[PDB]
């Protein structure tokens, strides 16, 4: 996260860290949506251009964390993956269209003050909150700058940007399965997700029922926090049918 700030303890209890076993390193962010399901970006698991192709046994899921590198004894819980499910129409060749994946945990994780699931939006939730100008929150342990690494989880609030503006800021083809967020040069304020934040959640707090909903998944960008550029996120509601299908079938 670039130009963000230290998260408060228990501020994002659904935040998950995808951890590579060997070499031990941060692989990506992710989110807890139930006691046995974790949501993340497909490119965190499969991305041929960078020879990335992890299997269940290659990583671990660390939940309830705050500190990036330290083992938070009695606070975080580490889980193994039973099975990975990548969207069958995920487009890694061009624009990361449908950049989404699910991971089923071998054992359910116990909730606590630091571990708690985030809600997934329904059609009305998405319609009412996914509006240009409305701000969401992105969290992660990724790079503090484009070109370093935070001590603790970082957080940044960013406004959703009008589709024409998102479209006009890049040569890449944008689909309805993605939306962009971030401040404009004239707005003065800064902030963006960055390498290592991928798979993390873009959340919004419903003013109607006061619950946090994950509207997006950190997906891609061109550089980080560059003027005139915006971060792109997987549109979670647009792909909820797939999410429900996988969970209904294998869980």
């Amino acid at each position: 996260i670039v130009e963000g700030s230290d998260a408060e303890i228990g501020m994002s209890p659904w935040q998950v860290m995808l951890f590579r076993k060997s070499p031990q390193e941060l692989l990506c962010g992710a989110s807890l949506i139930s006691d046995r399901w974790v949501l993340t970006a497909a490119h965190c698991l499969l991305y041929p251009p960078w020879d990335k192709n992890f299997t269940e046994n290659d990583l671990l899921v660390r939940i309830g964390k705050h500190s990036r590198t330290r083992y938070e004894r009695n606070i975080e819980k580490i889980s193994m993956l039973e099975k990975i499910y990548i969207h069958p129409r995920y487009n890694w060749r061009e624009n990361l269209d449908r950049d989404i994946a699910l991971m089923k945990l071998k054992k359910p994780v116990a909730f606590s003050d630091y571990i708690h699931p985030v809600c997934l939006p329904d059609r009305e939730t998405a319609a009412s909150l996914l509006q240009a100008g409305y701000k969401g929150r992105v969290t992660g342990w990724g790079n503090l700058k484009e070109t370093g690494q935070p001590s603790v989880l970082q957080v940044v609030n960013l406004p959703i940007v009008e589709r024409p503006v998102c479209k006009d800021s890049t040569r890449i083809r944008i689909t309805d399965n993605m939306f962009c967020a971030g401040y404009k040069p004239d707005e003065g304020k800064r902030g963006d997700a960055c390498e290592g934040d991928s798979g993390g959640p873009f959340v919004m707090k419903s003013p109607f029922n006061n619950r946090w909903y994950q509207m997006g998944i950190v997906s891609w960008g061109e550089g980080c926090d560059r003027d005139g550029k915006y971060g792109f996120y997987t549109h979670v509601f647009r792909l909820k049918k797939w999410i429900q299908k996988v969970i209904d079938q294998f869980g």
């Binding site: 951890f19 076993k21 031990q24 390193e25 941060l26 671990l60 590198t69 330290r70 083992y71 580490i78 193994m80």
Partner: peptide, 10 residues
């Protein structure tokens, strides 16, 4: 630079 985690987590 990550602190080692309990061996029980494979």
């Amino acid at each position: 630079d990550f602190e080692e985690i309990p061996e029980e987590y494979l």
